[PDB]
Amino acid sequence: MNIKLYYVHDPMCSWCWGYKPTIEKLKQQLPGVIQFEYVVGGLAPDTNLPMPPEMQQKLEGIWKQIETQLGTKFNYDFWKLCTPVRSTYQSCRAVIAAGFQDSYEQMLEAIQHAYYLRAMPPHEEATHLQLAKEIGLNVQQFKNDMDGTLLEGVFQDQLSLAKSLGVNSYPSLVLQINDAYFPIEVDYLSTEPTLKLIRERIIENM
């Protein structure tokens, strides 16, 4: 029997940044027989149009919700210092490209820190290349990888997979057992109920 937990996220998703300490603990605690697979869900298509000011006020107020409920840190200067753009695809391509040099998780964290703490635009090339350097990547290979057809192939496969798993919001977990798929509820604060749900599913399917 073949068992996999998909974690469907976006580097620019606020709740996923709120979820970070728990999903990392979850992945560490998961039994070794379960593969863990990240899937970018692709929160917003490529675009250069600046975010209209109502959408900016909304997203800012969501950061404050997450801070209140989860204790998550945000540098609110992002809304003052940057021109926010509703576009997340480049940041998904950056994490996948970093994954080619075995640094998927290091780049994911670096983009979340950039966006939520460092007041840096997470959709910009300048940010991605500055992060690639900081994280120790071969910057030139990372830049060629971002622009190659191999990466658009991988990226497209993950966007289709997120829709195929039935995911329309982030973060989401889906557990696969052979040919069957089971959504798993996210618990933001604790790993214990999530592991219970996973073990229970596996055992009901034996």
Annotated binding residues for Mg(2+): 18, 72, 181
In the set 49, 126, 180, 206, which binds its own copies (CB under 8 A)?
A: 206
Element (H, E) at 172: strand 172-177
Cβ contact 186:20 at 8 Å: no
Residue 180 in contact with its own copies, rule: CB under 8 A:
no
Residues between 52 and 71 that touch Mg ion (CB under 5 A): 55
Selected range binding Mg ion among 24-32, 82-90, 134-142, 189-197, rule: CB under 5 A: 82-90
Cβ contact 45:75 at 8 Å: no
CB of 205 to its own copies, least distance (A): 8
Binding at 119: pick from its own copies, Mg ion, none (beta carbon under 5-8 Å per type): none
Cβ contact 198:5 at 8 Å: yes
Question: Longest C-alpha distance within the chain, in Å?
Answer: 54
Residues between 12 and 51 that touch its own copies (CB under 8 A): 31-33
DSSP code of residue 4: E
In the set 27, 86, 113, 201, which binds Mg ion (CB under 5 A)?
A: 86
Cβ contact 18:70 at 8 Å: yes
Q: Please report, as ranges, the residues that interact with its own copies according to CB under 8 A.
A: 1, 3, 31-33, 199-200, 202-204, 206
